[PDB]
Design an enzyme around this catalytic site. Structure first.
Site, PDB file in Angstrom:
ATOM      1  N   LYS A 169       0.880  -1.192   0.000  1.00 51.83           N
ATOM      2  CA  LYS A 169       0.000   0.000   0.000  1.00 51.83           C
ATOM      3  C   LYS A 169       0.905   1.226   0.000  1.00 51.83           C
ATOM      4  O   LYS A 169       1.947   1.184   0.635  1.00 51.83           O
ATOM      5  CB  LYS A 169      -0.919  -0.015   1.222  1.00 51.83           C
ATOM      6  CG  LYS A 169      -1.975  -1.115   1.223  1.00 51.83           C
ATOM      7  CD  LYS A 169      -3.018  -0.956   2.338  1.00 51.83           C
ATOM      8  CE  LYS A 169      -4.256  -1.816   2.149  1.00 51.83           C
ATOM      9  NZ  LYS A 169      -4.866  -1.640   0.800  1.00 51.83           N
ATOM     10  N   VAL A 200      -0.619  -2.014  -4.537  1.00 48.66           N
ATOM     11  CA  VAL A 200       0.116  -2.848  -5.519  1.00 48.66           C
ATOM     12  C   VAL A 200      -0.308  -4.279  -5.253  1.00 48.66           C
ATOM     13  O   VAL A 200      -0.237  -4.723  -4.063  1.00 48.66           O
ATOM     14  CB  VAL A 200       1.630  -2.660  -5.405  1.00 48.66           C
ATOM     15  CG1 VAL A 200       2.379  -3.542  -6.385  1.00 48.66           C
ATOM     16  CG2 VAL A 200       2.016  -1.202  -5.562  1.00 48.66           C
ATOM     17  N   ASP A 246      12.370  10.745  -4.459  1.00 50.16           N
ATOM     18  CA  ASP A 246      12.028   9.951  -3.258  1.00 50.16           C
ATOM     19  C   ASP A 246      12.913   8.701  -3.118  1.00 50.16           C
ATOM     20  O   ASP A 246      12.350   7.634  -2.812  1.00 50.16           O
ATOM     21  CB  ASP A 246      10.544   9.565  -3.259  1.00 50.16           C
ATOM     22  CG  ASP A 246      10.059   9.148  -1.877  1.00 50.16           C
ATOM     23  OD1 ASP A 246      10.794   9.430  -0.883  1.00 50.16           O
ATOM     24  OD2 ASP A 246       8.977   8.540  -1.804  1.00 50.16           O
TER      25      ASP A 246
HETATM   26  N1  LIG Z   1       6.572   2.471  -9.794  1.00 46.73           N
HETATM   27  C1  LIG Z   1       6.261   1.683  -8.768  1.00 46.73           C
HETATM   28  C2  LIG Z   1       6.501   0.290  -8.799  1.00 46.73           C
HETATM   29  C3  LIG Z   1       6.189  -0.487  -7.673  1.00 46.73           C
HETATM   30  C4  LIG Z   1       6.435  -1.969  -7.636  1.00 46.73           C
HETATM   31  C5  LIG Z   1       6.703  -2.679  -8.839  1.00 46.73           C
HETATM   32  C6  LIG Z   1       6.958  -4.038  -8.876  1.00 46.73           C
HETATM   33  C7  LIG Z   1       6.916  -4.696  -7.665  1.00 46.73           C
HETATM   34  O1  LIG Z   1       7.112  -6.040  -7.463  1.00 46.73           O
HETATM   35  C8  LIG Z   1       6.962  -6.248  -6.100  1.00 46.73           C
HETATM   36  C9  LIG Z   1       6.660  -5.118  -5.451  1.00 46.73           C
HETATM   37  C10 LIG Z   1       6.633  -4.065  -6.454  1.00 46.73           C
HETATM   38  C11 LIG Z   1       6.366  -2.692  -6.444  1.00 46.73           C
HETATM   39  C12 LIG Z   1       5.638   0.180  -6.589  1.00 46.73           C
HETATM   40  C13 LIG Z   1       5.396   1.546  -6.645  1.00 46.73           C
HETATM   41  N2  LIG Z   1       5.736   2.305  -7.690  1.00 46.73           N
HETATM   42 CL   LIG Z   2       8.320  13.434  -2.206  1.00 48.68          CL
END
Ligand SMILES: Nc1cc(-c2ccc3occc3c2)ccn1
Ligand SMILES: [Cl-]
Ligand SMILES: [Cl-]
Length: 330
Positions: free
Chosen positions: A20, A26, A140
């Site tokens: 989250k 996700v 970030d």
């Molecule tokens: N751009 C992005 C990508 C992710 C991301 C992408 C692939 C992943 O496989 C396991 C956790 C996980 C999280 C999360 C948040 N922002």
């Molecule tokens: Cl930020």
């Protein structure tokens, strides 16, 4: 919002919640077309999150249309679609993040050798983002936003371009996670790609000691913890900084000092030399006698970090030059 077993668009079968964020959630999902598991980033159905996630999609697509060995340290966006009024970003699956890796060491840190492998991949990633036609500021960087490609291996990728902007497309003054926030952002100054390199320096010390270098409870505490290690920032920076007087006071002879509140170590006395344990067997002496952890290995690491923690974003070491540092020579 989403049940396990649920099927979307006769393509994706939702398995489970991975994570989250402020942006939404996700989920792990099976893609029947490619016949592979994917991670789907599901953005909240609100204008604020939609609009910022549309910027993330634009910056990922921009990165993908560049085929260079430097681009493969960024998570792959496979595609995106709209579903039930949520923007959905489909990525490759990755493993656990570098905060989980630290938690797994009981916050005692990974070896200088594993730290070096992370440093080299992250420096390559930053070199890629600095390509003129990208000029992407992550904004970030932190352990949580760096994921292992494979739980058996030391390959990593950067995720979460949710705060990211191109140079000259800044939206927010207040950005970065506080522990990893650059002096120029704390000081209210226009920022460039050098803020990522500051975060990286912070991250690499933490990966090896197990603990955040600068764990401010608020911006005043943040800047005070930076000053303990690195001293008072140079006058030429403080003179041009909108928020210098949040932290510092200028004196008759045109000099700067800390504003003090009710009771930190005197400026520049908390030496990175001692945090790292360069001459005392590494962090808490826990690396005493281990190979790849000599004084010479430590001194190279210290030198590179101090170049990444330059107060001046103009002279702070840049990705290509970081990759040529002795720390990375066999
Ligand atoms: N751009 C992005 C990508 C992710 C991301 C992408 C692939 C992943 O496989 C396991 C956790 C996980 C999280 C999360 C948040 N922002
Ligand atoms: Cl930020
Ligand atoms: Cl953290």
């Amino acid at each position: 919002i989403v049940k396990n077993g649920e099927k979307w668009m006769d393509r994706y079968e939702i398995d489970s919640l991975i994570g989250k964020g402020s942006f939404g959630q996700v989920v792990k999902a099976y893609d029947r077309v490619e016949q592979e598991w994917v991670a789907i980033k599901i953005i909240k159905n609100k204008k604020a999150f939609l609009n910022q996630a549309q910027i993330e999609v634009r910056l990922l697509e921009l990165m993908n249309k560049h085929d260079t060995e430097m681009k493969y340290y960024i998570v792959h966006l496979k595609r995106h679609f709209m579903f039930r009024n949520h923007l959905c970003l489909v990525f490759e699956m990755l493993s656990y993040n570098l905060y989980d890796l630290l938690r797994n060491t009981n916050f005692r840190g990974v070896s200088l050798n594993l730290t070096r492998k992370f440093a080299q991949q992250m420096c390559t990633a930053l070199l890629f983002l600095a390509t003129p036609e990208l000029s992407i500021i992550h904004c970030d960087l932190k352990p949580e936003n760096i994921l292992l490609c494979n739980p058996k291996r030391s390959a990593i990728k950067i995720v979460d371009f949710g705060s990211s902007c191109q140079l000259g497309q800044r939206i927010y003054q207040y950005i970065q996670s506080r522990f990893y926030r650059s002096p120029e952002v704390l000081l209210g100054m226009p920022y460039d790609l050098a803020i990522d390199m500051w975060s990286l320096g912070c991250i690499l010390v933490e990966m090896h000691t197990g603990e955040p270098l600068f764990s401010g409870a608020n911006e005043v505490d943040q800047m005070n913890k930076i000053v303990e290690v690195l001293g008072i920032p140079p006058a030429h920076i403080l003179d041009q900084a909108p928020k210098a007087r949040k932290f510092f006071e200028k004196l008759p002879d045109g000099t700067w000092n800390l504003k003090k509140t009710k009771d930190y170590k005197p400026p520049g006395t908390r030496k990175l030399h001692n945090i790292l344990g360069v001459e005392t067997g590494g962090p808490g002496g826990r690396r005493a006698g281990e190979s790849g952890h000599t004084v010479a290995d430590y001194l190279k690491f210290k030198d590179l970090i101090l170049r990444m923690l330059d107060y001046d974003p103009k002279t702070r070491i840049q990705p290509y030059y970081a990759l040529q540092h002795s720390f990375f020579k066999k």
